[PDB]
Design a protein around this ligand. Structure first.
Ligand SMILES: [K+]
Ligand SMILES: [K+]
Ligand SMILES: [K+]
Ligand SMILES: [K+]
Ligand SMILES: [K+]
Ligand SMILES: [K+]
Ligand SMILES: [Mg+2]
Ligand SMILES: [Mg+2]
Ligand SMILES: [Mg+2]
Ligand SMILES: [Mg+2]
Ligand SMILES: [Mg+2]
Ligand SMILES: [Mg+2]
Ligand SMILES: [Mg+2]
Ligand SMILES: [Mg+2]
Ligand SMILES: [Mg+2]
Ligand SMILES: [Mg+2]
Ligand SMILES: [Mg+2]
Ligand SMILES: [Mg+2]
Ligand SMILES: [Mg+2]
Ligand SMILES: [Mg+2]
Ligand SMILES: [Mg+2]
Ligand SMILES: [Mg+2]
Ligand SMILES: [Mg+2]
Ligand SMILES: [Mg+2]
Ligand SMILES: [Mg+2]
Ligand SMILES: [Mg+2]
Ligand SMILES: [Mg+2]
Ligand SMILES: [Mg+2]
Ligand SMILES: [Mg+2]
Lengths: 101, 91, 60, 59
RNA sequence: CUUCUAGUGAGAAAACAACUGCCCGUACCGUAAACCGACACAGGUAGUCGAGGAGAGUAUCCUAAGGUGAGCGAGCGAACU
RNA sequence: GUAUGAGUAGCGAAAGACAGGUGAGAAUCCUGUCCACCGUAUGACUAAGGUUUCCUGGGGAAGGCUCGUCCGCCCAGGGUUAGUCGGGACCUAAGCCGAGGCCGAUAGGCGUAGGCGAUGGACAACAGGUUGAUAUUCCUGUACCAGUUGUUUUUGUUUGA
RNA sequence: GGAGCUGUAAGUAAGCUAUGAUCCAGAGAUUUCCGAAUGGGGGAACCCAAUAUCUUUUAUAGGAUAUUACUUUUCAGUGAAUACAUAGCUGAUUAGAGGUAGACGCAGAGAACUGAAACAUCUUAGUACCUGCAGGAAGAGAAAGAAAAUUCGAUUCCCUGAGUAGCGGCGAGCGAAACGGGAAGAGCCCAAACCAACAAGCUUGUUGGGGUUGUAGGACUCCGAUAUGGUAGUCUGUUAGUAUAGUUGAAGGAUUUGGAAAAUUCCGCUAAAGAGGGUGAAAGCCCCGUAGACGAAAUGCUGACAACACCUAGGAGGAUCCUGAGUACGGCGGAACACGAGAAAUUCCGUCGGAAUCCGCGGGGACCAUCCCGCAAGGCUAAAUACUCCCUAGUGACCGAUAGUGAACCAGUACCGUGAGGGAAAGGUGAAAAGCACCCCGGAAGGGGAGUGAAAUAGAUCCUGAAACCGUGUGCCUACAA
């Protein structure tokens, strides 16, 4: 997948449009991704998860990975991805510039 | 079969503990097994001199979870009674 | 089975057609006789037919 | 693992198999009790027995 | 199972001590609310034990051991069934 | 799918009453006392059949022809210990299969030897206790059948037990 | 292949993973027990054994592995009546079993309802059913032919002939073939005469050589080539491709609405890619992808190319010999041929009888003569043709949950039945569980607030939510009327 854990990322669609953030986890079998600060839903929680009030948590729901646009780590302008065989090894590469990742 | 795959596990129950306090221990066993093999198995697994062995084979017990119903697996439970002048197996 | 060892003549079927050509099914059996034949150097009693006995050509 | 297992010799392979088998016996006991935490050691041991027997059979 | 010999045969008999003895069933219902009858159905369901008084008697009435109190009730006490 | 009949027939032979208790709630559950019913059974064994309905602890969504705190219902756990009981490692009847074989459009039918097959024959245990649930099975005593090893005492060594 | 992975299936635990996981593809190993089940039995998924080695136990008992069914083929050893021997027995070998694909095709056996407005011949129909043999196709197949042309040259299948010619209680109905046009294309072996070798007992069984036919052919007698082409063969190899994993694969950002933009407006970009699908709504430019370009270690498959292997000769004579015997044919009885005994040729089955062979034999729709065509009674043979349990890629003026498979949901299930067997119903929250923390009534369920959410009259009976039906309230009317 063109998205991978440890990647600063821009969002394309949603109420959290134009926000940035990194990848906390990725679900390829759903083609979804989780992003800190984005889609922070308010979950009425029970205390069976070591939360001795039950309470109301705020946690990041997944996001569909097609609503996402990666960032150049050297430009800030968000881009699309190509795959290139550099040094024999296959890596992601920016469009709009040849920067890796 | 092989002597360690003969025995599978012990049976921790109130009746079984009451038997442990009378020096005879319960064990789940390969359903294809034999009383002499249980004897050999314990004698080789604990260096304890066995005196007697009883066996039961338990029916499959009906169960269900929602729409879906079925059977608990068959079991064979041996009861291995030891001698005096022998060790007590530690579990 | 009930078959000539040599020619293979066996039971078949046929029709009895009456004078009004009412048709009914019949068995049509060949003329087989049990005969001590020298099969492969051994004498053996075997079904066999007159059409094979006529020729000589097979011994008793 | 398979590397050192293929490096071993036959009687050593069989001794190791027997010892894994005893370990599995004891783990079945500890699992019948509440005396075990690392349950995956069970599948690891069974996996390793399989590796060893496969290597013997393929020799 | 007993006997007979044919055969086979260098080991057999008793006393004592110790040891071994596999597989399936073993719960519970069972003149029934668990079996067969679509039902917790006034039906049917092999055999054994089956006490006492009176009595020929396992008949009959009331009881013993033991087991039951019936899986909708209350009142009113009409016609009619 | 929902009406109609209609909140009607029916609620499936028979005796229960009371006090207390549990409980949100009691004709219906529990304890107890009287009362009634069965008693060649409405009792105690047990084959088949059923196949978990058994025991414990919770429950009252549904089921139970009412209710229900209860159940053969639901949920989580447990429970069936045999050298001697019954059956097989023993025997066979009726009947079945059937090497080869015979007969036969095919397919197959019959049937010998030999096997299978109890409802029968043969075959070494029984007194008590014990669990919440198992009992000639577990426990304590006292045995019995078949067999093994060893010791002791005997007698048979090839006209040979 | 390159980072999340431990299925459905949440959730908890424990853990694995660039020391390259999960995942994907090829090959190999393990592959319990039943089942043809095959050591013997048996009520399938159970039981009991024999022999050899090894193991446990002081030793028995116990355990593991291997072998042990029947029948066929060959071989060997023993060996009865019964002497020779054979049968039989035993041991080694060899190849069969059984189910699939509710489909296709050869053969055996073979219906009836029905139609004929009844019905018996006839039809349905050589259908259904059953059974056997199978193969990827089968079957048929290289003329004892079709014709009338002196001519076409192996079978099969489509069109056509033609609903013709005929058959038929001359009724109902049944119904060709050839010519012609096309698809596909291929022809080969053997017995026999004779020759060489072996053997018993001049013939006569075996091996090899020879030779396969109709303008007759071959053997046999003479003349020369040693040739020349083909193959319907081989895990002989190589080579190339292809199937089974895959990789890459261009182009957009902002305003309005709105919970969300893919919609609207703005200017753009791209196209060997505007196929399709998904993405918070309708996206050529967000994603999967598409066009296009690359790619297989390993196992298969296909086609060529070399080696091996197998076939492959020419001209005169016919002195003589051979050219498929209980066969063709005939009688009787029956079938199939479009053809129902009819004038009934042709083919086949049963039975009985019963020819000649080159101046010979069969056919040309009774049959005779003439003419023409062909040479049976021995075998094989690809292709075009039929069908799909299945695999891959797909398509639809096909269905869209009473439809479409019986089955979109754990369906041949639950359930019914002794059994064969029959045989259902049941889909949709939301973009995302964010699925209602907390408070109140209540025993709980279920409500009411709060809160998430765009929306809760979207809250598990979940999108929409008709009608019947059950209610609540309300404007008008209604207790001398049929
Ligand atoms: K009495
Ligand atoms: K009996
Ligand atoms: K009639
Ligand atoms: K063929
Ligand atoms: K699109
Ligand atoms: K004819
Ligand atoms: Mg037992
Ligand atoms: Mg009992
Ligand atoms: Mg009742
Ligand atoms: Mg009424
Ligand atoms: Mg009642
Ligand atoms: Mg009486
Ligand atoms: Mg109970
Ligand atoms: Mg009720
Ligand atoms: Mg209870
Ligand atoms: Mg028979
Ligand atoms: Mg007999
Ligand atoms: Mg067997
Ligand atoms: Mg008719
Ligand atoms: Mg035609
Ligand atoms: Mg692209
Ligand atoms: Mg859409
Ligand atoms: Mg646009
Ligand atoms: Mg003729
Ligand atoms: Mg004839
Ligand atoms: Mg349907
Ligand atoms: Mg609908
Ligand atoms: Mg009036
Ligand atoms: Mg009025």
């Amino acid at each position: 997948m063109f998205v991978k854990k440890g990647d600063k990322v821009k969002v394309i669609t949603g109420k959290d449009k134009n926000k940035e953030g990194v990848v906390l986890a990725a679900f390829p079998k759903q083609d979804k991704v989780i992003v800190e600060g984005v889609n922070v839903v308010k979950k009425h929680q029970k205390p069976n998860q070591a939360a001795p009030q039950g309470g109301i948590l705020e946690v990041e729901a997944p996001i569909h990975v097609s609503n996402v646009m990666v960032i150049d780590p050297s430009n800030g302008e968000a881009t699309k991805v190509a795959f290139k065989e550099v040094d024999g090894k296959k890596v992601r590469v920016s469009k709009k510039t040849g920067e890796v990742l | 079969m092989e002597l360690l795959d003969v025995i599978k596990r012990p049976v921790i129950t109130e009746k079984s503990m009451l038997a442990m306090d009378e020096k005879k221990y319960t064990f789940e066993v390969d359903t294809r097994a034999n009383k002499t093999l249980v004897k050999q198995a314990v004698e080789s697994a604990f260096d304890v001199k066995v005196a007697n062995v009883n066996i039961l084979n338990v029916r499959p017990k009906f169960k269900r979870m929602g729409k879906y119903a079925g059977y608990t697996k068959k079991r064979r439970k041996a009861i291995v009674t030891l001698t005096e002048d022998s060790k007590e197996i530690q579990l | 089975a009930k078959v000539c060892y040599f020619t293979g003549r066996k039971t078949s079927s046929g029709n009895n057609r009456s004078h009004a050509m009412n048709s009914t099914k019949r068995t049509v059996k060949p003329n087989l006789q049990k005969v001590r034949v020298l099969i492969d150097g051994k004498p053996k009693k075997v079904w066999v037919s007159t059409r094979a006995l006529k020729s000589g050509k097979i011994e008793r | 693992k398979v590397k050192e297992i293929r490096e071993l010799t036959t009687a050593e392979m069989l001794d190791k198999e027997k010892q894994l088998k005893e370990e599995l016996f004891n783990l079945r006991f500890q699992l019948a009790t509440g005396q075990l935490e690392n349950t995956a050691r069970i599948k690891e041991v069974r996996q390793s027995i399989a590796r060893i027997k496969t290597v013997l059979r393929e020799q």
